[PDB]
Design a protein around this ligand. Structure first.
Ligand code: UMN
Length: 342
């Protein structure tokens, strides 16, 4: 078997000529020549079976992405594993290989308004489909938006994704949360478990602001610092928005802060298109009930050149399927990956 940077890659025979790409908690990723389709692909080796939280991320990633089929959502092309549960130590997930991601692009490149518009359109078109299946991505951020050489965009990493559950959304003040800090809606720190579609729209709002200036809009260094960066720009919540926060610890925290005025978007973003800033404002609304929805966002005048609801598909049916053990999640992973065996 091939090795890459001191790791076995048991992807053959089909997948050969393996170049390293990168690495994280998830595992390792390489490009590989796919000998059946005659194209290089991404393959990420997951070795999750000794941690039930990595097994959860693996099952979510595989189950959701095999159900979903959409031009702006990364697919799974193939999955490699051993022929039995016992011999299965790794899972290789094969996906279309993409040139870069929006994180890398923003650290190096100025985006034209035309590029910003097209990226935003694609994010929302993928998100329309995600949300139509009653799913929340819950970790939208520039590194989870893959880009090819002609700026086609695909949303990736569904390991935190959930079915939406807005009747179980309420929680207490300062409840801990897993998704990336800078893209967390203000309600996460106040009274929300992050089980509504409006969580994803906030993150998209954050991404949009970041495309306008190549800097994160709300770069909090710790849990509550994130709300204070948010309130620094949006200003103090209105009476009406506060009355919606019935939790007293959260309410009284907000009432304790000195009055802060709204920083106008056109002063933060002097070179931005005014329609982009109108849509930004609606995505970065403090009150999640007042926040724009994905379909309204698509219909916003900023995206008029692209908007076409007939060419913005939805899922044919809602998605469905939990503190289960590592060993049962392994079984589920084995069942879900069977279609790729000879
Ligand atoms: O799966 C991920 C996250 N990952 C990691 C990852 C690397 C690579 C690419 C990729 N990259 C390029 N191209 C790159 C060229 C260089 O520039 C950047 C772009 N093309 C195509 C692809 Cl699918 C995509 C991903 C991705 O979704 N986590 C998961 C799910 O939460 C799995 C299972 C698991 C277990 C524990 C914890 C996390 C996770």
């Amino acid at each position: 078997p091939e090795m890459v940077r001191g790791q076995v890659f048991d992807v053959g025979p089909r997948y050969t000529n393996l170049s390293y790409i990168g690495e994280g908690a998830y595992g390792m990723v390489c490009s590989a020549y796919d000998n059946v389709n005659k194209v290089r692909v991404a393959i990420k080796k997951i070795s999750p079976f000794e941690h039930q939280t990595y097994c959860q991320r693996t099952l979510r990633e595989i189950k959701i992405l095999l159900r979903f089929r959409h031009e702006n959502i990364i697919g799974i092309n193939d999955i490699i594993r051993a022929p039995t549960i016992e011999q299965m130590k790794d899972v290789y997930i094969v996906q279309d290989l993409m040139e870069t991601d929006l994180y890398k692009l923003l650290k190096t490149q100025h985006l034209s308004n035309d590029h910003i518009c097209y990226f935003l359109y694609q994010i929302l078109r993928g998100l329309k489909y995600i949300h139509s299946a009653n799913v929340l991505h819950r970790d939208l951020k520039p590194s989870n938006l893959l880009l090819n050489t002609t700026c086609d965009l695909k949303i990736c990493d569904f390991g935190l994704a959930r079915v939406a559950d807005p009747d179980h959304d309420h929680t207490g003040f300062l409840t801990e949360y897993v998704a990336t800090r800078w893209y967390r809606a203000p309600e996460i720190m106040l009274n929300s478990k992050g089980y509504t579609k409006s969580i994803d729209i906030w993150s998209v709002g954050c991404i949009l602001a970041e495309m306008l200036s190549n800097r994160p809009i709300f770069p909090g260094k710790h849990y509550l610092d994130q709300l204070n960066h948010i309130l620094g720009i949006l200003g103090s919540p209105s009476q009406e928005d506060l009355n919606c926060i019935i939790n007293l610890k959260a309410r009284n925290y907000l009432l304790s802060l000195p009055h802060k005025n709204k920083v106008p978007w056109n002063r933060l973003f002097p070179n931005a298109d005014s329609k982009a800033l109108d849509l930004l404002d609606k995505m970065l609304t403090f009150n999640p009930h007042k926040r724009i929805e994905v379909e309204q966002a698509l219909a916003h005048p900023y995206l008029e050149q692209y908007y076409d609801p007939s060419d913005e598909p939805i899922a044919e049916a809602p998605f469905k399927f939990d503190d289960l053990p590592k060993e049962k999640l392994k079984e589920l992973i084995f069942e879900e990956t069977a279609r790729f065996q000879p």
